[PDB]
């Protein structure tokens, strides 16, 4: 096993899912 980064960075906002959320914006027409 090897460690990997979890978040892509600190500056970016959650969700980590990213594109899966923005697609819903198109179809409708801790830190």
């Amino acid at each position: 096993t090897v460690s990997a980064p979890a978040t892509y960075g600190n500056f970016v906002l959650s969700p980590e899912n990213a594109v899966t959320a923005i697609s819903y914006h198109s179809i409708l027409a801790d830190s």
Partner: protein
Amino acid sequence: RVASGAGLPTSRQTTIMVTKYSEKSPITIPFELSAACLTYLRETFEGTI
């Protein structure tokens, strides 16, 4: 009216209606904004200074 005349009565009751005509005119200009910058308004960010 000037009533000083003894023998002179005005023919009119001094209620002269007067019609005029309107003139409409368009007021239009091109306008623009950047939707790529508008998305920051759409997404209501708060996470970083």
